[model samples]
Target chain A: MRLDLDFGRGLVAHVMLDNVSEEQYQQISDYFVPLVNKPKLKSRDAIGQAFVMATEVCPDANPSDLWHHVLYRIYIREKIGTDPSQSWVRTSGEAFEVALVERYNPVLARHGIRLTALFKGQKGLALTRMGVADRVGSRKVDVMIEKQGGGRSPDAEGFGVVGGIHAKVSLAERVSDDIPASRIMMGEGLLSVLSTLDVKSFPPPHGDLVNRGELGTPDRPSDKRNYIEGHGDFSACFSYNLRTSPSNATTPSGRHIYVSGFSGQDDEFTDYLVAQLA
Target chain B: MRLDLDFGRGLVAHVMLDNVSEEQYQQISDYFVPLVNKPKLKSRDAIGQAFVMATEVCPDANPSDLWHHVLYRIYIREKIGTDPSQSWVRTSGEAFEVALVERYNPVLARHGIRLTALFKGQKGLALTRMGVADRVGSRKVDVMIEKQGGGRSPDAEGFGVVGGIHAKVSLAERVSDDIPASRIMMGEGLLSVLSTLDVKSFPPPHGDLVNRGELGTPDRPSDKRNYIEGHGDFSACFSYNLRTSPSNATTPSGRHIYVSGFSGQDDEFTDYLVAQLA
Candidate 1:
């Protein structure tokens, strides 16, 4: 029987504001909601289910300059590509996954009045598509990022930085109507592990460097080779390159969003974003 | 009779401080003495002319940070570097074409003596070889900058940035005495044109494009061709690719500096000047 796990697990809603207008900020906060009381997940499936609970009262909490850096960090990986895929795993994340963007989006649709929110939801779909793909195939998933690049110089060169991820999900507790006794034992056993993992800062390999130790080991560790053992290839990556004006536009209160790599889909939505800013 | 052309030309001194050192700052001055003053000139034998006089007081500077910029617009070219073998223009009071770094010894050796008066006597021969090399041949000039690679994340790959001139020089007045006047300045007067030709900026050819239209007409314009101008063919050019770190660094006091380029000399000197600072 197919377990209909059409869940949006590793979906990342990357919202970048180059020039954060008062109106946009107002609109964002006005339609805002936060994903609260989020269950600290101990397995990939649990976290994947929890993302649907993610909401945004203030998704992008950074100030303009600092926000630009955070945006650039994601951009360099998602759109601006280098040698490796942008979504390659870097570290453990909300899931049993090793390298997700470390972000989750819940609260599905914002208030009914935001074109910007609508755009983010559409991007969520792309994230969801890849997320589902990873769960079903038990392998690396491919997702393209189409970040906005308006201020690119006429003579800009070189490709962008990229980020990628790989995910591994563990079905810690599956329920069957007849096996009532099996459920309680699994519940008690899993509760202890979940309590411990909740407050911990994920685990080792929680950054740009994936594997953290996969290099020096003489042979492949048996523990890392299977999803039933609480691990599978779960990772996500991103990167981008930007050429700004004033040479110092990235400083001060400048309104320039960083672009990592482009998935060539920016044209459909960037104009609306610019208009919103205008 | 040889004419002593060292009369009434303006003078200025440009310098770079590697670490924003107090010692380096103590020497640079903004208001420079003109290179030539009519009649008696500065010297009688064309061997002790002051290219640009930096007052003999410390500017009270500090060790440089990455990509720092200090504009000492007062440096006049070494009349000698502008012409190494022009001994034929022998005149009693003409300018002596001394090397750039050679001028510093006179001030340093005197226990940080008054530089304004150092040009007059025999004790003025104390400049270091590195000091002279710093000038005379730089494609352009700026203050010393801190080595890049901010000493963080000691394991990142690639070379970091350094502090130095972010520009290149395109025009030299006495081109005939140096690299051929007509090749640099065109249209109308040859020698007069070259003498009056203003340098667009350093990192030449590359930096000259936009300014070309403002200059009445455009010359050979191409990124490749322009970048070629910086290669000045000085024995050979030294360039590098900056891997990590911001191209610019700011001090806690808000002083800003930019890492442009550096001389790729010997291993020791190169390492000292371009050590990782991030």
Candidate 2:
């Protein structure tokens, strides 16, 4: 294969991983160490742990918006309020992919699928059949689960993708970003889901309390099926919409949408994924 | 619309534009000012000017690789070789999209296909019919051409896409990144093309002098049609493959692929785009 600029750094998590210092790297690992590979940990608890870690790093931040503060420490500077112009959104989104890979790899590997966070690279596996050259396929997944020893369509390498996760920091402009690739993955009978922090309401002062339009009415509990995931692009959605009590939502199609901090999601998220990927 | 993190800064050019100073901004404008809106300049001259401008910014960069230098001043640092860990590739690739927008908008506007850089926003146009919410459509185009007063399909407010440009700095891993979306655009009878800098040969000491496999066979010139464009995704490709005498190639479908610094591209690429857009 010809040289591609992306090589191994295609994963957005590279932003957080590649740019930080060894000490900073330790901070990230410090946050995830107790969380991963724990069967009893609820998804909401894992998300809660992230907030506590953010607090440990930035005691000055508003506890309500520690998500924002957490992102900066991991992405921008060892110090908070460092650069007025630097953005944490992109890094925050990609970092979630790394978080997923770290959180679920052990369980996934046992099922003959391993997670990788490369969406673009000459040597990597293609996630969708949306490219002129088979080598570099359209990057639909922020994190993908590759099947063991499976090298078929699109030639030589035989990197088969059985699941795709679109990790985002928020539900803002990304609800539709991965629909096409999700459609392709779904058609091939793969797992397609959105792994996101459901925190909306940013612009300071009154940033947010909740994004109701997204969650739907009690009568229409999983209304997402009629709109976003309904078209069947994403099979499910797992959100750390931390503001609310943990709950799980079932799409009209029987697919699940888990909102952490709810009784519905009182169980470990790793368990839910294990069942899905299995 | 509910607030989104990328309300205003969705374009990747935000990296260059958002991170630069007024003086630094002048350097970028200085590079493009003479070339855009000027009819007599060939595409080869435009790309060559980029090299000279890059040289102005980094007098020490290998003359043959000023492309790398130019990207640094615009994206990473005012000083060259300033940070060993800092990357210019992402910013450089996105900056090229801005370059195309700045180059074509003045001309495209007259024909009603104005360009905009914000691809994902609650209040922006959706390029593909691949989203749950009509407000935030799937973002496929790096720089897109929006219709004049055109708003239809997917609901009220009707924002339509006439053409899309996938801008990249190299052919390494991106050839297939935009193909799926391009297929969607082509089926819609819209223009889809690759705007790239055609430079390869990096990794120190010997990155490349040419990317022959991509350019294809002498016995069957314009063979790109058989493999790439022939897949019926991109209508054409416009490149700054600044290595040879400016020339343009026609695919099996008669779509044009302009390789700047060749006799075939002896005329202004802006002019060729003008006819294509018109």
Candidate 3:
């Protein structure tokens, strides 16, 4: 079934979903009414309400993934005020993502889940991969969500081990007139690096110091090449390079994702992100 | 000869001088021109200008007392704004007194006259009376202007010693309907105490603790009694009360002086004070 969402103007999102019962639809409507009507409701409360509703609708969905999808939708919709635009959407979208995970741990504690969301400065990726505590580096994942008992051991692999509950949020925004192609190449290249990273060490085998300039700037073309050389495969990592303008014509490499929206239609991209992440 | 001063409307001062030459009148007129014509002239400068003119007219006048008189006149005249009132005059009168002494040292230094106007905090009187230096008590003189080499010794009598150059400024204000008779009694009583004090020890016989409350407040009548007992004489003290109401009618005792002026007529009292001090 396709759930076609009209985010004002001509921007529409056609989302394909497995059949949801009539009861689930009513529950979602009930949850959304207060979420939309209430004045100045805190985003954390909004997230909890949305999470509870999403779980009711898709009871079998991965609770962790469902939480992310629900939070993303609320953030995107809030960003889409009267006369929606790309910059506004991108700004609020990033702000919401940060605010969501900040309170995500306590929010999940009510559901008997002991989860931790670590940010860049917290050496999130290193903790997830190595399990041994270490200081953070400049170029690292935006957020690393990990569950309890997910750490490295000789036989019991680290949280980054395949099938372990771990996800990295690497937010990206496509700029205008600037080297658009370079951004895509870099985004795809980063996905490749994340996908193939050794669960224990991160940068596969040929380890080298990575910095923010290497991650974002187009000047260091060799940095991207060197990064891809150390990477394993593109199956595990997901790439969501949110756009400020029209969607890119070229598709991302296999197992990696590239979602975009028309100018001033950020909800479309965010809607796609929610579905894919879920 | 009568010199009539118009302190605007109800504020008027009628001063009587022994005699003045045509040259003095012309000098005074010359001084008044600059005083009235200059804009934003500092009070100290105004006093200095007036003093230079007064001294030019009367070169033989005691420069020390001449300085005090000239400063007092400027202060009083300035306090008489468009609407002359006693409260206004008293407020600025005390303020001017303080400002005058604060810069008195440096101003005299220019004339090769090394002078010091010491306040209670400096233990001016206590240092003058005793060979040993000590802090002043609250009930002591407000300011004691003494010459160089004014402190105590066996052969070197202090500034208060006979033929010594010294002056005391003890500020007071006439208050209440009940003090119609009491101010004279109190003034006379204080004068007797000050006049006969031992030149060695300020209090004639024995020293006692003194505070500001004893000087002003009516409740502690015994404090005033004790203060009078310890006080030497009012011969050296110059009291500028700057009354907030009508002039007091009663005359002070012989060897004691009482000055009073009508509302807005601060110059009358100040003029009298300047002549007596000089």
Winning candidate number (lDDT): 2
Error of 3 at A250 (Å): 27
**Residue A112, model 2, lDDT:** 59
Cα error, residue B26 of model 2, in Å, equals: 10
Pick by TM-score: 2 or 3, better one: 2
* Candidate 3 residue pairs that clash: A196-A232, B139-B210, B172-B241, B193-B231, B193-B232, B193-B233, B194-B232, B194-B233, B195-B232, B195-B233
Interface RMSD of each: 38.2, 6.1, 39.5
| Rank order (by lDDT, best first) | 2, 3, 1
Give Cα-based local distance difference scores for all models. 0.22, 0.47, 0.32
The superposed Cα distance between candidate 3 and the true structure at residue B114, in angstroms, equals: 84
Q: For candidate 1, lDDT tens digit of each residue in B212-270? A: 21111114223212222332211111111121111123222221112222222233223
lDDT of 3 at B184: 33
TM-score of each: 0.16, 0.49, 0.23
lDDT of 3 by residue, B1-278 (tens): 34444434544454433233445655665674465325686443455456445545654433332333233444445443322223223333333334334434454333222223233255444334432122111122223333333322323433331112122222221111111122332342221112110111111122221111113222332222223222322332222222111112321323223322111222332343333323
Q: Give the TM-score of candidate 3.
A: 0.23
How good is model 2 by TM-score? 0.49
What docking grade applies to model 3? incorrect
